[PDB]
Coordinates of C-alpha atoms in Angstrom, one line a residue:
Chain A
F513 CA -92.2 45.8 -13.0
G514 CA -95.3 46.3 -15.1
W515 CA -95.6 49.6 -16.9
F516 CA -95.8 47.7 -20.2
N517 CA -98.8 45.9 -18.6
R518 CA -101.1 48.9 -19.2
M519 CA -101.1 49.2 -23.0
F520 CA -100.7 45.4 -23.4
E521 CA -104.2 45.1 -21.9
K522 CA -105.3 47.9 -24.2
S523 CA -103.8 46.0 -27.2
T524 CA -105.9 42.8 -26.8
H525 CA -109.7 43.1 -27.0
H526 CA -109.6 46.9 -26.1
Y527 CA -107.9 47.4 -29.5
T528 CA -107.5 44.1 -31.4
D529 CA -111.0 42.6 -30.9
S530 CA -112.4 46.2 -30.9
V531 CA -111.2 46.5 -34.5
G532 CA -112.6 43.0 -35.1
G533 CA -115.8 44.5 -33.8
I534 CA -116.2 47.3 -36.4
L535 CA -114.9 45.1 -39.3
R536 CA -117.8 42.9 -38.1
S537 CA -120.0 46.0 -38.6
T538 CA -118.6 48.4 -41.2
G539 CA -122.0 49.9 -42.1
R540 CA -122.2 52.7 -39.6
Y541 CA -118.9 54.3 -40.9
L542 CA -120.1 54.7 -44.5
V543 CA -122.0 57.8 -43.4
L544 CA -119.9 58.6 -40.2
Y545 CA -117.0 59.2 -42.6
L546 CA -119.2 61.4 -44.7
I547 CA -120.3 63.2 -41.5
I548 CA -116.6 63.8 -40.8
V549 CA -115.8 64.8 -44.4
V550 CA -118.8 67.1 -45.0
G551 CA -118.5 68.3 -41.4
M552 CA -115.0 69.5 -42.0
Chain B
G403 CA -90.9 65.9 -36.6
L404 CA -90.9 63.8 -39.8
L405 CA -87.2 62.9 -39.8
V406 CA -87.4 61.5 -36.2
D407 CA -90.4 59.4 -37.2
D408 CA -89.0 57.9 -40.4
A409 CA -86.1 56.7 -38.3
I410 CA -88.2 55.5 -35.4
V411 CA -89.6 52.6 -37.4
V412 CA -86.3 50.9 -38.3
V413 CA -85.0 51.4 -34.7
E414 CA -88.2 49.9 -33.2
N415 CA -88.6 47.1 -35.8
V416 CA -85.3 45.6 -34.6
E417 CA -86.4 45.9 -31.0
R418 CA -89.8 44.4 -32.2
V419 CA -88.3 41.4 -34.0
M420 CA -86.0 40.5 -31.1
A421 CA -89.0 40.3 -28.8
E422 CA -91.1 38.4 -31.4
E423 CA -88.8 36.3 -33.7
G424 CA -86.2 35.7 -30.9
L425 CA -83.2 36.1 -33.2
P426 CA -80.8 38.7 -31.8
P427 CA -78.1 39.7 -34.4
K428 CA -77.8 41.9 -37.5
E429 CA -80.0 39.4 -39.5
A430 CA -82.9 40.7 -37.3
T431 CA -82.5 44.2 -38.7
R432 CA -82.0 42.9 -42.3
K433 CA -85.5 41.4 -42.6
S434 CA -87.3 44.3 -40.9
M435 CA -86.6 46.6 -43.9
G436 CA -88.0 43.8 -46.0
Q437 CA -91.4 45.0 -44.9
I438 CA -90.3 48.7 -45.1
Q439 CA -88.9 48.8 -48.6
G440 CA -91.6 50.9 -50.4
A441 CA -92.6 52.2 -47.0
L442 CA -89.5 54.3 -47.2
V443 CA -89.1 55.2 -50.9
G444 CA -92.8 55.4 -51.9
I445 CA -93.9 57.3 -48.7
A446 CA -91.1 59.9 -49.4
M447 CA -92.2 60.1 -53.1
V448 CA -95.8 60.9 -51.9
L449 CA -94.5 63.1 -49.1
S450 CA -92.9 65.3 -51.8
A451 CA -96.2 64.9 -53.7
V452 CA -97.9 67.5 -51.4
Chain C
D7 CA -90.2 43.8 -64.7
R8 CA -93.8 44.5 -63.5
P9 CA -96.1 47.1 -65.2
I10 CA -97.7 49.3 -62.5
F11 CA -94.5 51.2 -61.8
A12 CA -93.7 52.0 -65.4
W13 CA -97.3 53.0 -66.2
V14 CA -96.8 55.7 -63.5
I15 CA -93.4 56.8 -65.0
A16 CA -95.3 57.6 -68.2
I17 CA -97.7 59.8 -66.2
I18 CA -94.7 61.8 -64.8
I19 CA -93.4 62.3 -68.4
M20 CA -97.0 63.0 -69.4
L21 CA -97.6 65.7 -66.8
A22 CA -94.1 67.2 -67.0
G23 CA -94.4 67.8 -70.7
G24 CA -98.1 68.7 -70.3
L25 CA -97.0 71.6 -67.9
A26 CA -94.2 72.6 -70.3
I27 CA -96.6 73.0 -73.2
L28 CA -98.1 75.8 -71.0
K29 CA -95.4 78.0 -72.5
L30 CA -98.4 79.1 -74.6
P31 CA -98.3 81.3 -76.5
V32 CA -95.0 80.0 -78.0
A33 CA -93.3 82.3 -80.4
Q34 CA -92.4 81.1 -84.0
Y35 CA -88.7 81.8 -84.0
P36 CA -85.7 81.3 -82.1
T37 CA -83.6 84.5 -81.9
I38 CA -81.0 84.5 -84.7
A39 CA -80.1 88.2 -84.8
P40 CA -76.6 89.3 -83.7
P41 CA -77.7 92.0 -81.1
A42 CA -78.5 95.5 -82.5
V43 CA -78.1 98.4 -80.2
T44 CA -79.1 101.7 -81.9
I45 CA -78.3 105.3 -81.0
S46 CA -80.4 108.1 -82.6
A47 CA -80.3 111.9 -82.6
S48 CA -82.3 114.5 -84.4
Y49 CA -81.0 118.0 -85.3
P50 CA -83.9 119.8 -87.0
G51 CA -83.4 122.1 -90.0
Chain D
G854 CA -113.4 108.8 -69.5
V855 CA -113.1 107.9 -65.8
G856 CA -111.8 104.3 -66.3
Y857 CA -110.8 102.2 -63.2
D858 CA -107.5 100.3 -62.4
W859 CA -106.1 98.3 -59.5
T860 CA -102.6 98.5 -58.0
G861 CA -100.7 97.1 -54.8
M862 CA -103.2 95.0 -52.9
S863 CA -104.7 94.1 -56.3
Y864 CA -102.3 91.2 -56.1
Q865 CA -101.6 90.8 -59.0
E866 CA -102.7 87.1 -59.4
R867 CA -101.6 85.5 -56.0
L868 CA -103.4 85.1 -52.7
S869 CA -104.7 81.7 -51.3
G870 CA -107.5 81.7 -54.0
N871 CA -106.2 80.8 -57.4
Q872 CA -103.2 79.4 -55.5
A873 CA -104.8 76.6 -53.4
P874 CA -106.9 75.0 -56.2
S875 CA -103.7 74.4 -58.2
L876 CA -101.7 73.7 -55.0
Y877 CA -103.7 70.7 -53.8
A878 CA -104.4 69.7 -57.5
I879 CA -100.9 68.5 -58.2
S880 CA -100.7 67.6 -54.5
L881 CA -103.3 65.0 -55.5
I882 CA -102.3 63.8 -59.0
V883 CA -98.9 62.8 -57.5
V884 CA -100.2 61.7 -54.1
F885 CA -102.3 59.1 -55.9
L886 CA -99.5 58.3 -58.3
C887 CA -96.4 57.3 -56.3
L888 CA -98.8 55.5 -54.0
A889 CA -98.7 52.9 -56.8
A890 CA -94.9 52.6 -56.7
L891 CA -94.2 49.2 -55.2
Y892 CA -98.0 49.2 -54.5
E893 CA -99.7 48.8 -58.0
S894 CA -103.5 48.5 -58.0
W895 CA -106.3 51.0 -57.7
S896 CA -106.9 49.8 -54.1
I897 CA -104.0 51.2 -52.0
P898 CA -104.3 54.8 -53.4
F899 CA -107.6 54.9 -51.4
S900 CA -106.1 52.9 -48.5
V901 CA -104.1 56.1 -47.8
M902 CA -105.5 58.9 -50.1
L903 CA -108.7 59.1 -48.0
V904 CA -107.0 59.2 -44.6
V905 CA -106.5 62.9 -45.2
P906 CA -109.8 64.2 -43.7
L907 CA -108.8 62.5 -40.3
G908 CA -105.9 65.0 -40.1
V909 CA -107.8 68.1 -41.4
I910 CA -110.9 67.6 -39.1
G911 CA -108.8 68.4 -36.0
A912 CA -106.8 71.2 -37.6
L913 CA -109.9 73.3 -38.2
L914 CA -111.1 72.2 -34.8
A915 CA -107.9 73.7 -33.4
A916 CA -108.3 76.8 -35.6
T917 CA -112.1 77.4 -35.0
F918 CA -112.1 76.6 -31.2
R919 CA -109.2 79.0 -30.5
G920 CA -109.5 82.1 -32.6
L921 CA -106.7 81.3 -35.0
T922 CA -107.3 81.5 -38.8
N923 CA -106.2 79.9 -42.1
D924 CA -102.8 81.5 -42.8
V925 CA -99.6 80.2 -44.4
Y926 CA -98.4 78.4 -41.3
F927 CA -101.7 76.7 -41.0
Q928 CA -101.5 76.0 -44.8
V929 CA -98.2 74.2 -44.5
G930 CA -99.3 73.0 -41.0
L931 CA -102.2 71.2 -42.8
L932 CA -99.7 69.9 -45.4
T933 CA -97.3 68.2 -42.9
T934 CA -100.1 66.5 -41.0
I935 CA -101.3 64.7 -44.2
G936 CA -98.2 62.9 -45.4
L937 CA -97.0 62.3 -41.8
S938 CA -100.5 60.9 -41.3
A939 CA -99.9 58.9 -44.4
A940 CA -96.6 57.6 -43.1
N941 CA -98.8 55.8 -40.5
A942 CA -101.7 54.7 -42.8
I943 CA -99.5 53.7 -45.8
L944 CA -97.3 52.1 -43.2
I945 CA -100.0 49.8 -41.8
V946 CA -101.3 49.2 -45.3
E947 CA -97.8 48.1 -46.1
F948 CA -97.9 45.7 -43.1
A949 CA -101.4 44.6 -44.2
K950 CA -100.7 43.8 -47.9
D951 CA -97.3 42.3 -47.0
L952 CA -99.2 40.0 -44.6
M953 CA -101.3 39.1 -47.7
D954 CA -99.9 38.6 -51.2
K955 CA -96.2 38.3 -50.2
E956 CA -97.1 36.2 -47.1
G957 CA -100.1 33.8 -46.7
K958 CA -103.6 35.3 -46.8
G959 CA -105.5 37.5 -44.4
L960 CA -108.8 39.0 -45.5
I961 CA -109.7 39.9 -41.9
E962 CA -107.5 37.5 -39.8
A963 CA -104.2 39.1 -40.8
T964 CA -105.3 42.7 -41.1
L965 CA -105.5 42.3 -37.3
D966 CA -102.1 40.6 -37.2
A967 CA -100.7 43.5 -39.1
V968 CA -102.3 46.0 -36.7
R969 CA -101.2 43.8 -33.8
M970 CA -97.5 44.7 -34.1
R971 CA -96.7 48.4 -34.9
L972 CA -98.9 50.4 -32.5
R973 CA -95.6 51.2 -30.8
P974 CA -94.5 53.4 -33.8
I975 CA -98.0 54.7 -34.8
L976 CA -98.5 56.0 -31.2
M977 CA -94.9 56.9 -30.0
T978 CA -94.3 58.5 -33.4
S979 CA -97.3 60.7 -32.6
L980 CA -96.4 61.0 -28.9
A981 CA -92.9 62.4 -29.6
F982 CA -94.6 64.6 -32.3
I983 CA -97.4 66.1 -30.1
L984 CA -95.0 67.0 -27.4
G985 CA -92.5 68.4 -29.9
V986 CA -95.1 70.8 -31.2
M987 CA -96.1 71.7 -27.6
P988 CA -93.5 74.4 -27.1
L989 CA -95.1 75.9 -30.3
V990 CA -98.8 75.9 -29.3
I991 CA -98.2 78.2 -26.4
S992 CA -95.1 78.4 -24.1
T993 CA -94.6 81.9 -25.6
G994 CA -97.3 84.5 -26.0
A995 CA -94.6 87.1 -26.7
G996 CA -91.7 85.4 -28.5
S997 CA -93.9 84.7 -31.6
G998 CA -97.4 84.8 -33.0
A999 CA -96.0 82.4 -35.6
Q1000 CA -95.1 79.4 -33.5
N1001 CA -98.6 79.4 -32.1
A1002 CA -100.1 79.7 -35.6
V1003 CA -97.7 76.9 -36.9
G1004 CA -98.1 74.6 -33.9
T1005 CA -101.8 74.6 -33.0
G1006 CA -102.7 73.8 -36.6
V1007 CA -100.4 70.7 -36.4
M1008 CA -101.2 69.0 -33.0
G1009 CA -104.9 69.8 -33.3
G1010 CA -104.8 68.1 -36.7
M1011 CA -102.5 65.5 -35.3
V1012 CA -104.6 64.2 -32.3
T1013 CA -107.5 63.3 -34.7
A1014 CA -105.0 62.0 -37.3
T1015 CA -103.8 59.7 -34.5
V1016 CA -107.0 58.6 -32.6
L1017 CA -109.3 58.4 -35.6
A1018 CA -106.6 57.0 -37.8
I1019 CA -105.5 54.3 -35.2
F1020 CA -108.8 52.4 -35.3
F1021 CA -111.8 54.4 -36.5
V1022 CA -112.9 55.2 -40.1
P1023 CA -110.5 55.1 -43.1
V1024 CA -107.9 52.8 -41.4
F1025 CA -108.6 49.0 -41.9
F1026 CA -111.6 50.1 -44.0
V1027 CA -108.6 51.1 -46.2
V1028 CA -107.6 47.5 -47.0
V1029 CA -111.1 46.0 -46.5
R1030 CA -113.8 48.5 -47.5
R1031 CA -111.5 50.2 -50.1
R1032 CA -110.2 47.1 -51.8
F1033 CA -112.9 44.5 -51.9
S1034 CA -116.7 44.4 -51.2
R1035 CA -116.8 44.7 -55.0
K1036 CA -113.5 43.7 -56.7

């Protein structure tokens, strides 16, 4: 019926353009990675 | 785990290319491993690396 | 024949022999001697 | 004339200390190395090499927020979820650099195309994994204190090696931030 429908909506925008959102940014994760690394 | 997961890719990639490329037969499998050549050998060689 | 693969093979042969040189300290010889098992007793006087 | 000496527990020369710094050392010289086999440049061995803290972060989270501690099963438990995490990163990096070079370009607009067709594996690989380690994390509080120690260190380190490695930091920044911006 449409169980495949759930993650297909999660794939586009909610994942694909979401990634295109932080590749548009990048900057915040130069230190957030270091927050994860030095946090661990 | 690992063993199930190294096999999951080649099983899925054929199910993936049939839904995408449209071509149904053995030749669909064929080309899948064209993008999983070093992603089988190299990954194993760096699995063993740890 | 591309380079990046071979230039890693050299590193394997580099590190394998570099870990095998850790047989330090390595002895001069090579055992030549046909085995010598000695029995000794002392009866004083 | 009272001179000290050490015996049984006094190792001798073993433990985790003086073992781990030479454990992960050659677990790094080779991890970087064969990540150039069919891969080549100084780029890709950062497109995967640095996805390792995404695994570890949850493993200590599972250890610290539970009471469990860094033993052998957590040691090898940390080691499985690091190459298994790689087998997802190095797998999408494969899909990425095969969408470029061997195919036809994709600085940003094929990295997406690569990460548009394999989230099946990268998630169901993890989904079958998480649940496979679930009979280990608990299920038995009497059968073993080993399955708990081996399992919690995996799936705790796995959930973050899945969710933070599906879209967050290293991933994508692996082929974008860790290849170009400079060279």
